[PDB]
Scaffold this active site. Structure first.
Site, PDB file in Angstrom:
ATOM      1  CD  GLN A  11      -2.744   1.321   2.492  1.00 51.55           C
ATOM      2  OE1 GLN A  11      -3.420   0.478   2.599  1.00 51.55           O
ATOM      3  NE2 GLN A  11      -2.411   2.431   3.403  1.00 51.55           N
ATOM      4  CB  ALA A  12       3.560   2.539   2.071  1.00 50.34           C
ATOM      5  CB  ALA A  99       1.497  -9.906   3.695  1.00 51.57           C
ATOM      6  CG  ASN A 206       5.088   7.470   7.225  1.00 50.57           C
ATOM      7  OD1 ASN A 206       5.400   7.984   6.234  1.00 50.57           O
ATOM      8  ND2 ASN A 206       4.267   6.279   7.249  1.00 50.57           N
ATOM      9  CD  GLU A 254      29.619  12.785 -11.118  1.00 53.71           C
ATOM     10  OE1 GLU A 254      29.673  13.091 -12.600  1.00 53.71           O
ATOM     11  OE2 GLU A 254      30.231  13.780 -10.438  1.00 53.71           O
TER      12      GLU A 254
HETATM   13  N1  LIG Z   1       3.847   7.586   3.774  1.00 54.70           N
HETATM   14  C1  LIG Z   1       2.973   6.571   3.714  1.00 54.70           C
HETATM   15  N2  LIG Z   1       3.098   5.731   4.667  1.00 54.70           N
HETATM   16  C2  LIG Z   1       2.075   4.657   4.542  1.00 54.70           C
HETATM   17  C3  LIG Z   1       1.054   4.580   3.387  1.00 54.70           C
HETATM   18  N3  LIG Z   1       0.314   3.482   3.462  1.00 54.70           N
HETATM   19  C4  LIG Z   1       0.775   2.755   4.546  1.00 54.70           C
HETATM   20  N4  LIG Z   1       1.830   3.525   5.141  1.00 54.70           N
HETATM   21  C5  LIG Z   1       2.754   2.920   6.351  1.00 54.70           C
HETATM   22  O1  LIG Z   1       3.191   1.580   5.818  1.00 54.70           O
HETATM   23  C6  LIG Z   1       3.136   0.899   7.059  1.00 54.70           C
HETATM   24  C7  LIG Z   1       1.993  -0.208   6.877  1.00 54.70           C
HETATM   25  O2  LIG Z   1       2.390  -0.938   5.814  1.00 54.70           O
HETATM   26  P1  LIG Z   1       1.300  -1.019   4.291  1.00 54.70           P
HETATM   27  O3  LIG Z   1       2.330  -0.571   3.076  1.00 54.70           O
HETATM   28  O4  LIG Z   1      -0.013  -0.515   4.364  1.00 54.70           O
HETATM   29  O5  LIG Z   1       1.183  -2.677   4.229  1.00 54.70           O
HETATM   30  P2  LIG Z   1       1.189  -3.659   3.056  1.00 54.70           P
HETATM   31  O6  LIG Z   1       2.818  -3.415   2.380  1.00 54.70           O
HETATM   32  O7  LIG Z   1       0.235  -3.229   2.001  1.00 54.70           O
HETATM   33  O8  LIG Z   1       1.214  -5.013   3.523  1.00 54.70           O
HETATM   34  P3  LIG Z   1      -0.086  -5.905   3.725  1.00 54.70           P
HETATM   35  O9  LIG Z   1      -0.936  -4.971   3.983  1.00 54.70           O
HETATM   36  O10 LIG Z   1       0.511  -6.522   5.211  1.00 54.70           O
HETATM   37  O11 LIG Z   1      -0.144  -6.927   2.669  1.00 54.70           O
HETATM   38  C8  LIG Z   1       2.539   1.683   8.152  1.00 54.70           C
HETATM   39  O12 LIG Z   1       3.632   2.000   8.707  1.00 54.70           O
HETATM   40  C9  LIG Z   1       1.832   2.608   7.517  1.00 54.70           C
HETATM   41  O13 LIG Z   1       1.915   3.937   8.272  1.00 54.70           O
HETATM   42  C10 LIG Z   1       1.258   5.856   2.558  1.00 54.70           C
HETATM   43  O14 LIG Z   1       0.418   5.903   1.690  1.00 54.70           O
HETATM   44  N5  LIG Z   1       2.140   6.708   2.759  1.00 54.70           N
HETATM   45 MG   LIG Z   2      -1.745  -3.937   2.288  1.00 55.34          MG
END
Ligand SMILES: Nc1nc2c(ncn2[C@@H]2O[C@H](COP(=O)(O)OP(=O)(O)OP(=O)(O)O)[C@@H](O)[C@H]2O)c(=O)[nH]1
Ligand SMILES: [Mg+2]
Ligand SMILES: CC[C@H](C)[C@@H]([C@@H](CC(=O)N1CCC[C@H]1[C@H](OC)[C@@H](C)C(=O)N[C@H](C)[C@@H](O)c1ccccc1)OC)N(C)C(=O)[C@@H](NC(=O)[C@@H](NC)C(C)C)C(C)C
Ligand SMILES: Nc1nc2c(ncn2[C@@H]2O[C@H](COP(=O)(O)OP(=O)(O)O)[C@@H](O)[C@H]2O)c(=O)[nH]1
Ligand SMILES: [Ca+2]
Ligand SMILES: [Mg+2]
Lengths: 440, 69, 424
Positions: A11-12, A99, A206, A254
């Site tokens: 997601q992130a 996951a 974050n 570089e």
């Molecule tokens: N800066 C930022 N942080 C995010 C975002 N989405 C989730 N996070 C952070 O990412 C972490 C959660 O992981 P995610 O990326 O949501 O999880 P995922 O990789 O999709 O993994 P599963 O959902 O467990 O399959 C937490 O620390 C959240 O604060 C985003 O859009 N921007």
């Molecule tokens: Mg996810």
């Protein structure tokens, strides 16, 4: 030539990818249907923006990017959103079951079912390149997919592309927006597994971004949208040398030469300025001297830590916009007088500087003022290890009681992998101590 | 000097290849170990549930034995 | 896309089950005939988690109704929302369980279990990606407690990698005078500790006390108790049913809430509790012992993990400030060796009749008080081997009673061990 393939994981990674690619389109004048009227060569070319965009015969400029997530709902928004025409459907890859915030499911149980398909799609992108330079991988530390699938992917990329460079943008967790108690476990596991596979990793704390949005942009309670717009400006700053050229431009490779003195010491601290609201920027000229000084204010860092309590091994300044050599040289002179920037005794102290003349862009509806000039400092400082120490401490508290460990063991992991990962982190912290000690 | 030049570039190739080789083997090892561990955890779970089924059969057998007496 | 299959068993199970469906049907704008007539797309975004779509855009609860006698289910069928359920998903016997766990688990229930499983497989087969099961039942009776726990075992056998969640109503002498209830409950808890991933402890003792003391109902009805239950079940499933970041599916909830596999018994809470609010007030009340649906004082234990869900239009800045305040001011009651163990979600959609509400889910070692209360009642009968013929007459052995008691006492010991643990 010199193509870069971006991979956005979980997601992130995906949501930050949304923000980055939208911003890149605005920077290069690419419409959401992928047309770019200013581009006179149809169906190909070797312009600087082509490192990040391929082209079709029909004039479409297509991100050299793969988005992957183990559930579909985040990438589904890409598929139906504003920039849906930008991506070929095969670039957007989803599974059905995520996951569940579990490194083990991302790396093994669930990730193993989609990894071959993901590599196949990356290979299709790689085949289009005439001189692939490397990969840029965007992911959270904390999520099960961002941690576990990224590790699996990085391991597989080392096998399939050898020592082709792989850079990370890694989202480090903060309690204000975290979604799982086990994020310290996932963080340590993925940092251990990926360490020998990554050439350079830019951590994005974050909490630092959250603080900057609250303090500098007066955003009461930052959302992921607020965080990601800021992050994308920082990412854009760092990749600008690849996407634009100019006489004063210095390539990211570089800077990397200066930033990584030993293979494991590859985590630069990024600091970005100016971060200012429209309201405050109105009738305010922020000079080269002012934005440069702001780089040494810890409030503007992407990772919370204190470089004044550490030693530098390198300092790079990446300027964009209305920035001329004489003003940069004068600003650095001033800083070297007023700030004590302490380097280790085995590194030279000169700052490496790149300038791109194209000014920063902002996306409509954002909180960032549009400014004439901006800078991102990349420094290699022993202070970055503070961020490891905070995570390692949280890991230790839970692991001592084996809290939540059964979720990982139930998916096939062993306690030995936890202790092996934590020992590697202990060794990393010790490495950062050791490079700071004076020579005999 | 030419022999040395040849040795340097063959060394670079060999080390790159050996990196790939060891990454490849480490991963296959990890995946096989994980697969076996997860399968063993499921097998044990099913084994316990199947013992419950057996126990339940005995309970009904016990009731039937009690009944005519 | 991530479907949950709902099963309700026995009198209590079907009563609170039906109320749950009435309540969330209204929240999602589904009428008793299964037609959607709502105002907001957020209502349909994740509708498939609990409802199947049929021809003519009908929504049908993914719900299986189970009992060993037909009375309650007849009641449900000619209820308000009776017609909304799939007729083939009613599975019932005729002979009842006579408040006997052994009848429910080994005899009568065992004769009916296979036809229930046939309906379960049908519902599970048509799922795009099944996440798991939720069961409503009481622990005090015979069908819900005995057959309910039998179903859990059988389902787990065929879906060993799916999450198993229960809403388990604990018995109290105040609500019912049936003497064998601590037996049925202790035998039940023995099954739950081994075979569910997460269990919401709905305590009739707490429900009666809230109704009598707080709502000032002189003679609380079962209807009064279930009103609390349906509010609670709505609250703790909000993050499953509406778009959101936190604990958005059964497994992510479990990974956040269960640090050790046996310690998966939750104390739910709800605010406001009213019968004829600022964010600070909402927050105070949800952590208040008076607002817990399990009869335990959290100040008599420590929290391992907490999920807090706020509903309504409110300031997220304020919610964040107040949740930090509660943790800081009460730090002694949160285990220090699980950092950041309290997670907070905010959903813009309030429940029926409120502007804002707060729902609390705690994994607190103080839940041992609930198990101790049952254990006391259990042992008083079992020491004198009272009323055992009911159970031995179905083929059971004394040793199974001993084991059940032993397991439950172990569960209490383990809560105490982690309550007592320190970081240093
Ligand atoms: N800066 C930022 N942080 C995010 C975002 N989405 C989730 N996070 C952070 O990412 C972490 C959660 O992981 P995610 O990326 O949501 O999880 P995922 O990789 O999709 O993994 P599963 O959902 O467990 O399959 C937490 O620390 C959240 O604060 C985003 O859009 N921007
Ligand atoms: Mg996810
Ligand atoms: C405290 C225990 C339950 C709660 C109350 C309640 C039962 C009830 O509400 N019952 C008995 C099914 C009928 C129902 C109510 O009757 C008035 C209807 C309106 C209802 O609540 N209907 C709801 C909406 C319906 O969903 C429903 C739910 C469960 C069952 C049936 C129907 O009646 C006061 N009971 C037994 C009592 O208060 C009884 N008290 C005792 O038996 C006490 N010992 C003498 C102890 C056990 C409490 C007195 C009547 C002597
Ligand atoms: N809260 C609540 N408890 C109930 C209800 N019906 C029965 N109970 C409780 O359930 C226990 C008896 O089990 P019951 O479901 O009636 O027996 P079964 O049909 O064999 O499962 C007793 O402790 C009752 O107090 C109800 O509608 N609401
Ligand atoms: Ca072109
Ligand atoms: Mg009854």
């Amino acid at each position: 030539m010199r193509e870069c393939i971006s991979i956005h994981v979980g997601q992130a990674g995906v949501q930050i990818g949304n923000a980055c690619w939208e911003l890149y389109c605005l920077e290069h004048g690419i419409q959401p249907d992928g047309q770019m009227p200013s581009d006179k060569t149809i169906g190909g070319g070797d312009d600087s923006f082509n490192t990040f965009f391929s082209e079709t015969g029909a004039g479409k400029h297509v991100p050299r990017a793969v988005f992957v997530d183990l559930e579909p709902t985040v990438i589904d928004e890409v598929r139906t959103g504003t920039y849906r025409q930008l991506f070929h459907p095969e670039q957007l890859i989803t599974g059905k079951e995520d996951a569940a915030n579990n490194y083990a499911r991302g790396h093994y149980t669930i990730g193993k079912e989609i990894i071959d398909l993901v590599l196949d799609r990356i290979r299709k992108l790689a085949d289009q390149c005439t001189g692939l330079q490397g990969f840029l991988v965007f992911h959270s530390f904390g999520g099960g997919t961002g941690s576990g699938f990224t590790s699996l992917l990085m391991e597989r990329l080392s096998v399939d592309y050898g020592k082709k460079s792989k850079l990370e943008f890694s989202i480090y967790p903060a309690p204000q927006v975290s979604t799982a108690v086990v994020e310290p476990y996932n963080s340590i596991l993925t940092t251990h597994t990926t360490l020998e596979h990554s050439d350079c990793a830019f951590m994005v704390d974050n909490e630092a971004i959250y603080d900057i949005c609250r303090r500098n942009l007066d955003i009461e309670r930052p959302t992921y949208t607020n965080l990601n717009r800021l992050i994308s400006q920082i990412v854009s700053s760092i990749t600008a040398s690849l996407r634009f050229d100019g006489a004063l431009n210095v390539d990211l490779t570089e800077f990397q030469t200066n930033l990584v003195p030993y293979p494991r010491i590859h985590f630069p601290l990024a600091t970005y300025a100016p971060v200012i609201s429209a309201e405050k920027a109105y009738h305010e000229q922020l000079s080269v001297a002012e934005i440069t000084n702001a780089c040494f204010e810890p409030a503007n860092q992407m990772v919370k830590c204190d470089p004044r309590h550490g030693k530098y091994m390198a300092c790079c300044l990446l300027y964009r916009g209305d920035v001329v050599p004489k003003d940069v040289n004068a600003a650095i002179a001033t800083i070297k007088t007023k700030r004590s920037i302490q380097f280790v005794d085995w590194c030279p102290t000169g700052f490496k500087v790149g300038i791109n003349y194209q000014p920063p862009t902002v996306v409509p509806g954002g909180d960032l003022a549009k400014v004439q000039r901006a800078v991102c400092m990349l420094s290699n400082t022993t202070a970055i290890a503070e961020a490891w120490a905070r995570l390692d401490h949280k890991f230790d508290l839970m692991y001592a009681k084996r809290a939540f460990v059964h979720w990982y063991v139930g998916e096939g992991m062993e306690e030995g992998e936890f202790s092996e990962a934590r020992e590697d982190m202990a060794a990393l912290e010790k490495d950062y101590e050791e490079v700071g000690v004076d020579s005999v | 000097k030419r022999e040395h030049e040849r040795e340097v570039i063959q060394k670079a190739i060999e080390e790159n290849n050996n990196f790939i080789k060891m990454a490849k083997e480490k991963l296959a090892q990890k995946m096989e170990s994980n697969k076996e561990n997860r399968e063993a955890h499921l097998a044990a779970m099913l084994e316990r549930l199947q013992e419950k089924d057996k126990h339940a059969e005995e309970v009904r057998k016990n009731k039937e034995l009690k009944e005519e007496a | 896309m991530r479907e949950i299959v709902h099963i309700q068993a026995g009198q209590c199970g079907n009563q609170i089950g039906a109320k749950f469906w009435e309540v969330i049907s209204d929240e999602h704008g589904i009428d008793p005939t299964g037609s959607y007539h709502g105002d907001s797309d957020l209502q349909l975004e994740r509708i498939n988690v609990y409802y199947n779509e049929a021809t003519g855009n009908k929504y049908v609860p993914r719900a299986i109704l189970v009992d060993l006698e037909p009375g309650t289910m007849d009641s449900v069928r000619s209820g308000p929302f009776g017609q909304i359920f799939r007729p083939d998903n009613f599975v019932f016997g005729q002979s009842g369980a006579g408040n006997n766990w052994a009848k429910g688990h080994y005899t009568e229930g065992a004769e009916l279990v296979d036809s229930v499983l046939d309906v379960v497989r049908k519902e599970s087969e048509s799922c795009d990606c099944l996440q798991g099961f939720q069961l409503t039942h009481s622990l005090g009776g015979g069908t819900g407690s005995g057959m309910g726990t039998l179903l859990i075992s059988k389902i787990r056998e065929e879906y060993p990698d799916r999450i198993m969640n229960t809403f388990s109503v604990m018995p109290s002498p105040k609500v019912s005078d049936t003497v064998v209830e601590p037996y049925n409950a202790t035998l039940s808890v023995h099954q739950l500790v081994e075979n569910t991933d997460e269990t919401y402890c709905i305590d009739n003792e707490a429900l009666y006390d809230i109704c009598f003391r707080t709502l000032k109902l002189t003679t609380p009805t079962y209807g009064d108790l279930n009103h609390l239950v349906s509010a609670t079940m709505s609250g703790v499933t909000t993050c499953l049913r509406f778009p959101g970041q936190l604990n958005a599916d059964l497994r992510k909830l479990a990974v956040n809430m269960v640090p050790f596999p046996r310690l998966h018994f939750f104390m739910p809470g709800f605010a406001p509790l009213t019968s004829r609010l600022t964010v600070p007030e909402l927050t105070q009340q949800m952590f208040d012992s008076k607002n817990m649906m399990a009869a335990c004082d959290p100040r008599h234990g420590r929290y391992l993990t907490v999920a807090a869900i706020f509903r309504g239009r409110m300031s997220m800045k304020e919610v964040d400030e107040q949740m930090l305040n509660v943790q800081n001011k009460n730090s002694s009651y949160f285990v220090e060796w699980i950092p950041n163990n309290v997670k907070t979600a905010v959903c813009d959609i309030p429940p029926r009749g409120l502007k804002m509400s707060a729902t609390f889910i705690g994994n607190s070692t103080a839940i041992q008080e609930l198990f101790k209360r049952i254990s006391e009642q259990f042992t008083a009968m079992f020491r004198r081997k009272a009323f055992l013929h009911w159970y031995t007459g179905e083929g059971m052995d004394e040793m199974e009673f001993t084991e059940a008691e032993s397991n439950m006492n172990d569960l209490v010991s383990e809560y105490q061990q982690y309550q007592d643990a320190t970081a240093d």
